[PDB]
Design a protein around this ligand. Structure first.
Ligand SMILES: CCC[C@@H]1CCc2[nH]nc(C(=O)NN)c2C1
Length: 294
């Protein structure tokens, strides 16, 4: 880009480098993502361009999409910190429950919105949840997975995390439903509460087996059709399901109930974002402000 003074390199995304930049004309500060190449499928460009109309307060705004000289630039609204960095910074004391609740509530609203427009994220993780000083949290990179797919390694060869991946994806499902995002958010909810990743898998089978060890090896009883999935193996070990009281202490029964519904094995049974917003857990939701040192 020629009309963008690039303040700094913010990070490295799944698809490309991210810079903090200042638009010389509007003076606005944005997050500029630079992506890759055999001409780049125009099918992706159309899909991505449609995201410019997917506007919501809990969705990072996509300001522009520019395809030029073998590169694809995505211009996004800028937020000062991501949830991964905030959780690390809050590791010693933990994120207060009221803020955890507020963040989950807002993330579900963002999901409810995109899902109602038939757009899935598919690769939700702390790294793409951005926060500001106002107490808001927004989902970034929504819709990019439908356009580019989720690779095994990023453009820098970094391993794309499997920690938040729904079991139906790990088992080979061809079609992803909105339920995949609810699963990822549930894993993130648990991580905020316990200050440790729920299922820190370091391979696809380790990821699947960690899920099984906590939630029990799935069977036709809890997940009709699971034994017919592409990568299901009758030889998977059979682990017993653990009590959520042991999984996310010391979260209260309302939060444990909601998390259990977000982590149902059967995608068709997993709670929707819309239904989750009405869960008793959010009865006393508020909008606290985090302490951010920028
Ligand atoms: C998930 C990585 C891509 C995001 C796109 C939107 C976005 N907005 N701000 C940032 C940022 O990193 N600020 N420190 C990002 C990064």
């Amino acid at each position: 880009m020629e009309n963008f003074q690039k303040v700094e390199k913010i990070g490295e995304g799944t698809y490309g480098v991210v810079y903090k930049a200042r638009n010389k004309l509007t003076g606005e500060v944005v997050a500029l993502k630079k992506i890759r190449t055999e001409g780049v499928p125009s099918t992706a460009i159309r899909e991505i361009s449609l995201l410019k109309e997917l506007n919501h307060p809990n969705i990072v705004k996509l300001l522009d999409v520019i395809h030029t000289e073998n590169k694809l630039y995505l211009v996004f609204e800028f937020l000062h910190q991501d949830l991964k960095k905030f959780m690390d910074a809050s590791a010693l004391t933990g994120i207060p429950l009221p803020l955890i609740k507020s963040y989950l509530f807002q993330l579900l609203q963002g999901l409810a919105f995109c899902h109602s427009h038939r757009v899935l994220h598919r690769d939700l993780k702390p790294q793409n949840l951005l926060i500001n000083t106002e107490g808001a949290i927004k989902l970034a990179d929504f819709g990019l997975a439908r356009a580019f797919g989720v690779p095994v390694r990023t453009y820098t060869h970094e391993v794309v995390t499997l920690w938040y991946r729904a079991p139906e994806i790990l088992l080979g499902c061809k079609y992803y439903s909105t339920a995949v995002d609810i699963w990822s958010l549930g894993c993130i909810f648990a991580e905020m509460v316990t200050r440790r990743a729920l299922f820190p898998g370091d391979s696809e089978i380790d990821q699947l087996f960690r899920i099984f060890r906590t939630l029990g090896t799935p069977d036709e009883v809890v997940w009709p059709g699971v034994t017919s999935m592409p990568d299901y193996k009758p030889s998977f070990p059979k682990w017993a399901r653990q009590d959520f009281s042991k999984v996310v202490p010391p979260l209260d029964e309302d939060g444990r109930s909601l998390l259990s519904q977000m982590l149902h094995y059967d995608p068709n049974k997993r709670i929707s974002a819309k239904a989750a917003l009405a869960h008793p857990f959010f009865q006393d939701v508020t909008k606290p402000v985090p302490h951010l040192r920028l």
